[PDB]
Amino acid sequence: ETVQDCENKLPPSLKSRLCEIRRYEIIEGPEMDKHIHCVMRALDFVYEDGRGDYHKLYDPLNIIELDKRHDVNLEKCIGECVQVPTSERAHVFYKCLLKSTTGRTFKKVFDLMELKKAGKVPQHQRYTAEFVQIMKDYDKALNC
Ligand SMILES: NCCc1c[nH]c2ccccc12
């Protein structure tokens, strides 16, 4: 199951707001809670109960932007998400990470993984100027 599959599956109050979502803008409520769980699982960033996986993010974050703060932000955000209910957990992880100083680099790792899993860029693809354009054109095909 891919991010595209999760998007295909959006109910219709959320799908008119696709581009907001795909800009990493925060949207609340339990429809969003279950989209973001779907996508975080599709990208292999959270466990089944929806808890952030430290080890899926630590190395990828640090390769792009080497920074001690990724450890700190990961521990904080996992700590938060564990304390909310499972319906809400992956979304809370996602929201926390985006708000932290790791947000910048998280969006890059997230973009890269999305397009790697979509077969659109090679598995060793780095966050290059070319890649930024590939992402923009990919979004444009989606009306974003
Ligand atoms: N290329 C980023 C697309 C994106 C950002 N946040 C999302 C949340 C749900 C699904 C896609 C996204």
Number of helices: 9
Q: Kindly report the CATH topology.
A: Recoverin, domain 1
**Major β-sheet annotation:** none
Q: Any idea what the radius of gyration is?
A: 14 Å
SS elements, strand count: 0
CATH architecture label name: Orthogonal Bundle
**CATH domain class:** Mainly Alpha
Distinct ligands: 2-(1H-indol-3-yl)ethanamine
Order of helices and strands: HHHHHHHHH
Count of distinct structural domains: 1
> Into which percent range does the helicity of residues fall?
55-70%
The 3D shape can be described as globular
**C-alpha termini separation:** 22 Å
Fourth-tier CATH superfamily name: Pheromone/general odorant binding protein domain
Q: Given the helix and strand composition, which structural class is it?
A: mainly alpha
Q: Beta-strand percentage? A: under 5%
PDB class: transport protein
Keywords: ALL-helical, odorant-binding protein, transport protein
Assembly: monomeric
Entry title: Crystal Structure of Anopheles gambiae D7R4-tryptamine complex
Question: Please, could you describe this protein's structure?
Answer:
This protein has 9 helices and no strands. 64% of the residues lie in helices and 0% in strands. It has helices spanning 3-8, 12-15, 18-22, 30-42, 54-64, 69-83, 89-99, 103-117, 129-140. With 144 residues, it is an all-alpha fold. It has a single domain (1-144), classed as Recoverin, domain 1. It starts with a helix and ends with a helix. 2-(1H-indol-3-yl)ethanamine (TSS) binds at residues 3, 21-22, 24, 36, 39, 110-111, 114. Histamine binds at residues 94, 111, 114. One of its GO terms (cellular component) is extracellular space. Pfam families: PBP_GOBP (PF01395).
